[PDB]
CSV table of C-alpha atoms in Angstrom, one decimal:
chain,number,residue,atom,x,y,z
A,1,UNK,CA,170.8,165.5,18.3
A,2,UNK,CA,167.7,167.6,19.7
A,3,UNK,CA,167.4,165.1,22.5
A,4,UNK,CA,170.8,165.7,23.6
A,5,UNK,CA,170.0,169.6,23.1
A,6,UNK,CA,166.9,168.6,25.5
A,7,UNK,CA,168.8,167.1,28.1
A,8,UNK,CA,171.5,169.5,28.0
A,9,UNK,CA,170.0,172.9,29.1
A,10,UNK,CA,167.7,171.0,31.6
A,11,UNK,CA,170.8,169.6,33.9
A,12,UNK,CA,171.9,171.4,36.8
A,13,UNK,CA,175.6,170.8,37.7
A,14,UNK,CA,176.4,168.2,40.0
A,15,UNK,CA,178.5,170.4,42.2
A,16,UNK,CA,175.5,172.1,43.6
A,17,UNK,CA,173.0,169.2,43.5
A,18,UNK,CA,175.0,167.0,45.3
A,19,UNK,CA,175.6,168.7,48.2
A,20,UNK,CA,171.7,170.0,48.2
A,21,UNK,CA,170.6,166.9,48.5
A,22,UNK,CA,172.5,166.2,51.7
A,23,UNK,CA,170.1,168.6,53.5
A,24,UNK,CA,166.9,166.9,52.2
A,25,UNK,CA,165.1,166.3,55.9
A,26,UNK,CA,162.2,169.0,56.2
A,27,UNK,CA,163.6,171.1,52.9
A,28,UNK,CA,162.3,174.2,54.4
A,29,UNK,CA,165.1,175.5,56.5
A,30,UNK,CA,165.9,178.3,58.8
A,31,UNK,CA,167.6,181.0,57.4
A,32,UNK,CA,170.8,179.5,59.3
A,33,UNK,CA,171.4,176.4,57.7
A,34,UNK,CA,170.8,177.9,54.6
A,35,UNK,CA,173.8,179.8,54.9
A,36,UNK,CA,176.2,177.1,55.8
A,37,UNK,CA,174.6,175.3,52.8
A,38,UNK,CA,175.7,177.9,50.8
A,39,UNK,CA,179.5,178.3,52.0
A,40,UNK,CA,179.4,174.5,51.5
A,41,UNK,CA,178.7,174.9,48.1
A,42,UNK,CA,181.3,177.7,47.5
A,43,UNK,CA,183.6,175.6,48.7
A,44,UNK,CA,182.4,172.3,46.7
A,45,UNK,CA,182.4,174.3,43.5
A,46,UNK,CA,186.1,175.6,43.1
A,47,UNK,CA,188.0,172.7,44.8
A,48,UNK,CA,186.2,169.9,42.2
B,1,UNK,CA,139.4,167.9,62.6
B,2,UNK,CA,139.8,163.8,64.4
B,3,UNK,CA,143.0,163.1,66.1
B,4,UNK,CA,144.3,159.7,67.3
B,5,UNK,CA,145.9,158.7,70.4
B,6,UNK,CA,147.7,155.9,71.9
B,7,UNK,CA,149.7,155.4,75.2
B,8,UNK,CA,152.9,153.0,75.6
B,9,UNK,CA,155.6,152.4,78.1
B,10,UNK,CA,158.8,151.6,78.3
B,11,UNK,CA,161.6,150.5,80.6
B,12,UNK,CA,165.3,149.9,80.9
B,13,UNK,CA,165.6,145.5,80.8
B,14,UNK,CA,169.5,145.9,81.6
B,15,UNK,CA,171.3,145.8,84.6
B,16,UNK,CA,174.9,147.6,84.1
B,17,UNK,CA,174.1,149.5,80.4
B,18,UNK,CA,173.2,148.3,77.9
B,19,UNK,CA,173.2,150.9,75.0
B,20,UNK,CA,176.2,153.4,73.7
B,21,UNK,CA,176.5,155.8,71.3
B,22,UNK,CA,179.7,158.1,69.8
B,23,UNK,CA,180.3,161.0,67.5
B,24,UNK,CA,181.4,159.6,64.4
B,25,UNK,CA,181.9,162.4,61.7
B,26,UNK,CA,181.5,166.5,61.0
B,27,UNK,CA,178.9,167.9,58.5
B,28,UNK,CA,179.1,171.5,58.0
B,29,UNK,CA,179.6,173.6,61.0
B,30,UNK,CA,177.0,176.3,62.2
B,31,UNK,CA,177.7,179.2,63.9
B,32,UNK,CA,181.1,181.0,62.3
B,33,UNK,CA,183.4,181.2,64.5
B,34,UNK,CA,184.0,185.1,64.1
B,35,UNK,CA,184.4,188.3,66.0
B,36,UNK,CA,180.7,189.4,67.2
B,37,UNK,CA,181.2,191.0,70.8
B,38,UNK,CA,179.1,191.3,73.0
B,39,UNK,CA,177.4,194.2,74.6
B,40,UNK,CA,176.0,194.9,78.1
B,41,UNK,CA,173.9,197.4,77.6
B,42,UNK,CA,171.2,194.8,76.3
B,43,UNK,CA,170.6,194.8,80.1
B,44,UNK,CA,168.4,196.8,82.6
B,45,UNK,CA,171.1,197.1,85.2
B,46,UNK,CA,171.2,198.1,88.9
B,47,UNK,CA,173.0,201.3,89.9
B,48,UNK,CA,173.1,203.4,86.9
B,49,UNK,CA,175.0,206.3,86.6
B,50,UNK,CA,173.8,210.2,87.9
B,51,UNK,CA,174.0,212.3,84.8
B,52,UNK,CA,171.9,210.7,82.2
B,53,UNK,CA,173.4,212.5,79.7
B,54,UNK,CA,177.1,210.6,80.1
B,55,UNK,CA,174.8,207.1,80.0
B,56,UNK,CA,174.0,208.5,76.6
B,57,UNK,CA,177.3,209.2,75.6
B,58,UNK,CA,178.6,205.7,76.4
B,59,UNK,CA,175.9,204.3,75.1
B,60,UNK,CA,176.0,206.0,71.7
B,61,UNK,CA,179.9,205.3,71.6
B,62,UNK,CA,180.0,201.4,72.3
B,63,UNK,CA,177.1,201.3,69.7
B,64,UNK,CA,179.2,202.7,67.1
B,65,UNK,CA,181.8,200.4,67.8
B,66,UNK,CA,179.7,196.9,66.9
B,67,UNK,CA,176.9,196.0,64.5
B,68,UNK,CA,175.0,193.4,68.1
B,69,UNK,CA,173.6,196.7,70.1
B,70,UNK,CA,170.1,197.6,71.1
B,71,UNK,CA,167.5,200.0,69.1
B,72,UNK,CA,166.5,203.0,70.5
B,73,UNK,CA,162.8,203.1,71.2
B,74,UNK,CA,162.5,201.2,73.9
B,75,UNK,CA,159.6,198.6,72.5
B,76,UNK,CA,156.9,197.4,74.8
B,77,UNK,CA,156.3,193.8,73.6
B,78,UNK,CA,159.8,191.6,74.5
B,79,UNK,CA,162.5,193.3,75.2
B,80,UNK,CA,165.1,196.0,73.5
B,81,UNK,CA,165.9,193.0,70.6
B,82,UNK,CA,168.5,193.8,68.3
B,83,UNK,CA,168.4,195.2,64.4
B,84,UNK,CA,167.0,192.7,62.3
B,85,UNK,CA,169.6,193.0,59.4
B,86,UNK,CA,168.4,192.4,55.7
B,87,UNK,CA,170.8,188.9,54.7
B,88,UNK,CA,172.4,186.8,56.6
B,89,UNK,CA,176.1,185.0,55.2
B,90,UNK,CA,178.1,182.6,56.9
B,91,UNK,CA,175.3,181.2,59.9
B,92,UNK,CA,173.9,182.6,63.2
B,93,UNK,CA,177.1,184.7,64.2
B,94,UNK,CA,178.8,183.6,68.2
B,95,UNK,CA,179.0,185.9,70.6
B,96,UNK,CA,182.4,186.8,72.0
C,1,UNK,CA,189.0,196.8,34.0
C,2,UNK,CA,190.4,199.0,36.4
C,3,UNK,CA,188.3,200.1,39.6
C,4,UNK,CA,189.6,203.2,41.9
C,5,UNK,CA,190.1,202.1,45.3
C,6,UNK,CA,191.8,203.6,48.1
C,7,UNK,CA,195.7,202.4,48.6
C,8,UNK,CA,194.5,201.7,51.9
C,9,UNK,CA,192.7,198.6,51.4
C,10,UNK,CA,193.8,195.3,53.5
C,11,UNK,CA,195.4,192.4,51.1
C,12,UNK,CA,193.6,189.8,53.3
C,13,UNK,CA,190.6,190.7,51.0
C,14,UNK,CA,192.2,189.4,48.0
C,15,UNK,CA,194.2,186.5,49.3
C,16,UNK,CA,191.3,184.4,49.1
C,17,UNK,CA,188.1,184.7,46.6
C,18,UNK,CA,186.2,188.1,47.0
C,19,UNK,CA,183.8,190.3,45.3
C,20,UNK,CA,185.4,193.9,42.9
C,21,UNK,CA,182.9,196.0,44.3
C,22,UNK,CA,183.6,195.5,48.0
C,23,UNK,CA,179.9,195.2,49.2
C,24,UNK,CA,179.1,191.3,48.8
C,25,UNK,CA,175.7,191.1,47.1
C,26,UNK,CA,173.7,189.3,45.6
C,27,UNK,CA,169.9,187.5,45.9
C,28,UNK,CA,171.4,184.1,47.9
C,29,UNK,CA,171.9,185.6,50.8
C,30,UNK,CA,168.3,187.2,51.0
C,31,UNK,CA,168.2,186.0,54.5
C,32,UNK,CA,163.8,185.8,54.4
C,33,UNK,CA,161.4,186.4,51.5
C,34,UNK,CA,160.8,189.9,52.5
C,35,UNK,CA,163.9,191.8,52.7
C,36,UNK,CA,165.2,194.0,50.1
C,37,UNK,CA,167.4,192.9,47.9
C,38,UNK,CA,168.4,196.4,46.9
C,39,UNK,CA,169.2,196.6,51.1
C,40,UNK,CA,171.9,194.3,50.8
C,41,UNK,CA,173.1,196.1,48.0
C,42,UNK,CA,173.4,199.7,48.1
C,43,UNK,CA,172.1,200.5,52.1
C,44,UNK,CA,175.0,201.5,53.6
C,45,UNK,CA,173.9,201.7,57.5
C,46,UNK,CA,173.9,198.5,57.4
C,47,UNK,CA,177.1,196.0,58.2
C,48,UNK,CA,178.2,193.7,54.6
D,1,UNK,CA,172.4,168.9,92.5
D,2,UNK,CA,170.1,167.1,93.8
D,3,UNK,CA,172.3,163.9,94.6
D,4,UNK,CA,175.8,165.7,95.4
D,5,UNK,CA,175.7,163.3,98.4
D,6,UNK,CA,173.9,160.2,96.6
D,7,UNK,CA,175.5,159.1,93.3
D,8,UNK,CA,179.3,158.4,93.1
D,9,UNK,CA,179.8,158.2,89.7
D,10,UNK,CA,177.4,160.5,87.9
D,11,UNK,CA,179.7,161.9,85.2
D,12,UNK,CA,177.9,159.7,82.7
D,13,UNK,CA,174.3,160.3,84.2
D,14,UNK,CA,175.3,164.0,83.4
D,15,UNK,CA,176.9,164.3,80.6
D,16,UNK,CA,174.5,162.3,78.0
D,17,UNK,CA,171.7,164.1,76.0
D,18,UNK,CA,171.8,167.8,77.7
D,19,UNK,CA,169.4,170.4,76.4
D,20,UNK,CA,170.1,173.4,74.2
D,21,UNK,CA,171.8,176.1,76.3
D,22,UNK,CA,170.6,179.1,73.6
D,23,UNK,CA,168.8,178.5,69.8
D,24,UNK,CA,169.8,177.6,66.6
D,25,UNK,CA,167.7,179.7,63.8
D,26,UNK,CA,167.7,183.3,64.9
D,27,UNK,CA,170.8,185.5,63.1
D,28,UNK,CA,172.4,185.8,66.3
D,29,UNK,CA,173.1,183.4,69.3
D,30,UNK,CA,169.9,183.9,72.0
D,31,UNK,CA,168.9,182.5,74.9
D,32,UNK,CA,166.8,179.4,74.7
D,33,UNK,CA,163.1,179.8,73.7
D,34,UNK,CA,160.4,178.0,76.7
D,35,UNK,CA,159.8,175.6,74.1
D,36,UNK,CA,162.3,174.2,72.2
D,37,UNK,CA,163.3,170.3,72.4
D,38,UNK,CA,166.7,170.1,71.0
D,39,UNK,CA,169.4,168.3,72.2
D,40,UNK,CA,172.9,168.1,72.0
D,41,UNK,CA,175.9,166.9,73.5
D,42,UNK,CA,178.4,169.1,75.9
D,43,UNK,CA,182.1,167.7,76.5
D,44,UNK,CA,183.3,171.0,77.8
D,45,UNK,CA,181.0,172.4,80.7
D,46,UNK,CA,181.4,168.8,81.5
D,47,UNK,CA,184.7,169.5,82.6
D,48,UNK,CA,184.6,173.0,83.0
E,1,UNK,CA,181.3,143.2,64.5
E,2,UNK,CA,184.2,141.9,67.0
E,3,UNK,CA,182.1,138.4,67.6
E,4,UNK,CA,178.9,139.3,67.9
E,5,UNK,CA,176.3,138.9,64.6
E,6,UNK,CA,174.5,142.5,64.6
E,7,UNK,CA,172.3,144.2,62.1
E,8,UNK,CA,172.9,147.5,60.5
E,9,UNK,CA,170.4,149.8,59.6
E,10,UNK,CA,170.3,153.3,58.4
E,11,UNK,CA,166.2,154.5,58.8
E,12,UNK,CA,166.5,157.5,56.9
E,13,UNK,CA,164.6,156.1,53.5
E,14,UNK,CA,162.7,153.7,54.7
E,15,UNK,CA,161.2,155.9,57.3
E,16,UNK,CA,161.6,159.8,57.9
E,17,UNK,CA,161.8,160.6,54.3
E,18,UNK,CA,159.3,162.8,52.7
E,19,UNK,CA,158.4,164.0,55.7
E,20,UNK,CA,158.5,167.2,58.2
E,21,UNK,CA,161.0,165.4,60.3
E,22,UNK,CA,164.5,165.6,61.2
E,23,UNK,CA,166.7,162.9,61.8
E,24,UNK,CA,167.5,162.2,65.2
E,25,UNK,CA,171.3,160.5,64.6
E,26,UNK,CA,172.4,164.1,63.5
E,27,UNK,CA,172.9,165.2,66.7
E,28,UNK,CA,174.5,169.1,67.8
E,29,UNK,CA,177.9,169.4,69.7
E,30,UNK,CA,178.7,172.6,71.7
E,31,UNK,CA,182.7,173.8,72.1
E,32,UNK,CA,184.0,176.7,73.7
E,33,UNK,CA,187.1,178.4,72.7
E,34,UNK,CA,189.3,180.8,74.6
E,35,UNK,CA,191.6,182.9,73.5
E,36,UNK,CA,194.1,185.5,75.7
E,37,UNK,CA,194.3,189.0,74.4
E,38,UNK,CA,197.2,191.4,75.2
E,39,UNK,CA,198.7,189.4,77.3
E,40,UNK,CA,202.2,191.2,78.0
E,41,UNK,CA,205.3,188.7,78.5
E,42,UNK,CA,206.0,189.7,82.0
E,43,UNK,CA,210.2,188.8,81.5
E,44,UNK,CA,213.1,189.5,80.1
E,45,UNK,CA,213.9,186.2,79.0
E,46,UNK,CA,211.2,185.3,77.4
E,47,UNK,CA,210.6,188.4,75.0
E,48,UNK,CA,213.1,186.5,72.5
E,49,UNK,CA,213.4,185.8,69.0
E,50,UNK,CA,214.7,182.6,67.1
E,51,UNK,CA,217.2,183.5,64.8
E,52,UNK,CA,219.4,187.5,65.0
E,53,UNK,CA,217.4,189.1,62.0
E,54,UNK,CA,214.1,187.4,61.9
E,55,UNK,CA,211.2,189.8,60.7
E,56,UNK,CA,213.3,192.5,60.8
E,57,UNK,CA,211.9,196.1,59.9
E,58,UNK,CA,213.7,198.9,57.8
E,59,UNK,CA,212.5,201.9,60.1
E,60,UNK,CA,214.9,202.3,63.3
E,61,UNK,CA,212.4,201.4,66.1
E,62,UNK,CA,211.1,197.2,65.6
E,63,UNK,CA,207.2,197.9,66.1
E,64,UNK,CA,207.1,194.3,67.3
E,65,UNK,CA,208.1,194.9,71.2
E,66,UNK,CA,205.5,197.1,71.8
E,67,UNK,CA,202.8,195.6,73.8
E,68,UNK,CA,200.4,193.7,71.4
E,69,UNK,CA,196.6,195.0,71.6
E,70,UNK,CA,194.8,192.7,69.1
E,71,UNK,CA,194.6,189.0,68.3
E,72,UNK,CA,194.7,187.4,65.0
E,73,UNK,CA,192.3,183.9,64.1
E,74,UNK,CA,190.9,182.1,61.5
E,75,UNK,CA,186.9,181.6,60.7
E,76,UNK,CA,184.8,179.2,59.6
E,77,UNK,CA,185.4,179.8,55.5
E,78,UNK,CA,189.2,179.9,56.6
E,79,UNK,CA,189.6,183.6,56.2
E,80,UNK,CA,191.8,186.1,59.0
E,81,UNK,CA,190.0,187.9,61.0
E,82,UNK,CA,190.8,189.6,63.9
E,83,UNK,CA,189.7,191.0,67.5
E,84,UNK,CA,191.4,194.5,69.0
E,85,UNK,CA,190.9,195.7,71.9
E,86,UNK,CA,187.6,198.3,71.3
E,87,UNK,CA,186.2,195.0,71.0
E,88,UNK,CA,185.9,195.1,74.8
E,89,UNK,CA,184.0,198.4,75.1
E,90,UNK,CA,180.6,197.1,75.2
E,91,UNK,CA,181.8,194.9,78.5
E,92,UNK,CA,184.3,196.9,80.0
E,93,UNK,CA,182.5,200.3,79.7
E,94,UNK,CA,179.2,199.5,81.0
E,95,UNK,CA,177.9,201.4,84.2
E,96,UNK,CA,178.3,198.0,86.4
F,1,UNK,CA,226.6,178.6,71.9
F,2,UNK,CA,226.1,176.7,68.6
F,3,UNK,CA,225.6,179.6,66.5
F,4,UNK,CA,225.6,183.6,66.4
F,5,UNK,CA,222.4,184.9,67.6
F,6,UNK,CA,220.1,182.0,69.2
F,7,UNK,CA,217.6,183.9,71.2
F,8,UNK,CA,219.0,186.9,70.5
F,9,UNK,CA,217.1,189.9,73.2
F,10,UNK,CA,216.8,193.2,72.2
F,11,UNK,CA,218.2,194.5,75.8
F,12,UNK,CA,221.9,195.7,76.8
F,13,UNK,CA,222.5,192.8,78.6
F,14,UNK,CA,221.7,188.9,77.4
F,15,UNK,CA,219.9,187.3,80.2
F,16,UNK,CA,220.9,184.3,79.3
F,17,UNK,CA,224.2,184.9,80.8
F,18,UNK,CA,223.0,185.2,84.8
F,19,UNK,CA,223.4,181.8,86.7
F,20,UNK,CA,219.9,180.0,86.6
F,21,UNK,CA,218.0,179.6,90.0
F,22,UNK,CA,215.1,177.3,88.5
F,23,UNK,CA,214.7,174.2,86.5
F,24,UNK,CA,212.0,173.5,84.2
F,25,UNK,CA,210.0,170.2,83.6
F,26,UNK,CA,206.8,168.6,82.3
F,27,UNK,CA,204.0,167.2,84.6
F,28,UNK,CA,202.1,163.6,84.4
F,29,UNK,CA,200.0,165.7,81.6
F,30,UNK,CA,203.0,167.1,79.9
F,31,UNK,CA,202.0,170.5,81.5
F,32,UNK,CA,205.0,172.8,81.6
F,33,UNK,CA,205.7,173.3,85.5
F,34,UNK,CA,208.7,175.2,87.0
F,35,UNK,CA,210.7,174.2,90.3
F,36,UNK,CA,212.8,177.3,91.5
F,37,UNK,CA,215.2,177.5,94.2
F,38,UNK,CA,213.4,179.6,96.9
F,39,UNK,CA,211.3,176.5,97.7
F,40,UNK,CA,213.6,174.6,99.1
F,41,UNK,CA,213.4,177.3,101.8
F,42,UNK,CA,211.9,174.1,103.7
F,43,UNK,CA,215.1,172.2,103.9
F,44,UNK,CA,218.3,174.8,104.2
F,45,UNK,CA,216.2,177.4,106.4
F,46,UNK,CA,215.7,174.8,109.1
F,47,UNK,CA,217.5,174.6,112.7
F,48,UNK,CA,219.4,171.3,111.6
């Protein structure tokens, strides 16, 4: 039970780490592609 | 602070081509494709006008039309860049 | 809730997702690490 | 160009791996910096 | 592939991962996009509807044959935006 | 016509009534390219 509780509140959804981890190459970007990231993800949470 | 070097060389073996490549698929796009006109006054023209104080009107007018216009103070280092806005939304914005 | 709001404002605002208090906010869209976030929210000289 | 009298068919030899025409990380679209390597690819000031 | 034996590689774990460095099959692409703006249909034919009683107003006077001054597009996120015509001030109102 | 109204103008008189003078027709590209009657001012305007 308390290792489920463990795992549980440590998971991020996979909505948003999917699609973060299509960006990995140099993971310090410009304050552009950040943006388009982020309407990405707006998009990729609703729709599934 | 050593650094390491190493020259090479290359050349092209083939006689018509040899090598091709093709767009294949669309990540995200990255410039929205919005409404961010342009303005001319960015630019130290020729023959300006002859009373300074309609060049001032204009000015001030066509700059409280569009968020892309120049600051005021002319700075000395570069040249008359735009307002650095606090956040950014959709991607570096296209200039129509 | 109910929020006052002019009977002017556009419908192409609420066709699609959008934000009640008309100013889109929030600390994603910080832009560097030196901004203020209370710029984006309440500084109105600025464009949304 | 150089070779307007020279080359035949140069619409491949031009229209390849041309560099940036403005940059890519600043919030709005600017010319292009003297030092920036990226390249893209053009289809349309190919053909004008 | 076709009838040629070819490898098929993709170097992005193997090499380029974990490191400063971008990958250099992601390439840019660069379209332009034009779009007339109050255009006036300069006919009689052509300023035509479909159907008798398409889009039809209740007030006397249709506000649709007046001379259009805006355009309407979509962006990026796939929201309307639009572009009137004091869009053109900072270019049409300059001194030059 | 087939049914009340096609291409209906809001004018006094319908312009579709007049006698044509043109004729209409698509290009090698399928690009829309009119052929009207005062260009074959070349063959009736001659001394034959």
């Amino acid at each position: 039970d308390q290792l489920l509780g463990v795992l549980l509140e440590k998971a991020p959804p996979l909505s948003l780490l999917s699609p973060i981890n299509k960006f990995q190459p140099e993971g310090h970007l410009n304050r552009v592609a950040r943006a388009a990231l982020l309407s990405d993800l707006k998009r990729r949470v609703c729709a599934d | 602070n050593f650094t390491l070097t190493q020259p090479r060389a290359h050349v092209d073996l083939g006689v018509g081509y040899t090598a091709v490549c093709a767009t294949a698929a669309l990540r995200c796009p990255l410039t929205d494709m919005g409404n961010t006109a342009q303005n001319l006054f960015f630019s130290r023209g020729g023959v300006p006008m002859l009373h300074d104080n309609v060049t001032e009107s204009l000015r001030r007018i066509t700059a409280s039309g569009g968020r892309l216009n120049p600051t005021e103070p002319l700075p000395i280092f570069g040249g008359l860049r735009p307002a650095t806005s606090a956040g950014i939304a959709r991607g570096q914005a296209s200039v129509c | 809730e109910f929020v006052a709001m002019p009977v002017s404002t556009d419908l192409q605002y609420f066709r699609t997702a959008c934000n009640p208090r008309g100013r889109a906010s929030g600390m994603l869209y910080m832009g560097d690490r030196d901004a203020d976030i209370e710029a984006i929210m309440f500084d109105h000289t600025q464009s949304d | 160009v150089n070779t307007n009298c020279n080359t035949l068919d140069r619409l491949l030899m031009e229209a390849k791996a041309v560099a940036s025409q403005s940059s890519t990380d600043t919030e709005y679209q600017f010319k292009r910096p003297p030092g920036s390597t990226e390249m893209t690819q053009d289809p349309c000031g190919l053909f004008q | 592939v076709g009838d040629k034996l070819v490898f098929l590689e993709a170097l992005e774990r193997r090499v380029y991962q974990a490191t400063r460095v971008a990958y250099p099959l992601i390439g840019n692409i660069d379209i332009t996009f034009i779009m007339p703006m109050g255009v006036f249909q300069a006919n009689s034919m052509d300023r035509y509807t479909r159907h008798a009683g398409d889009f039809s107003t209740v007030s006397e006077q249709d506000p649709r044959q007046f001379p259009p001054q805006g355009i309407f597009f979509y962006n990026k996120d796939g929201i309307l935006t639009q572009l009137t015509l004091r869009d053109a001030m900072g270019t049409i109102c300059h001194s030059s």
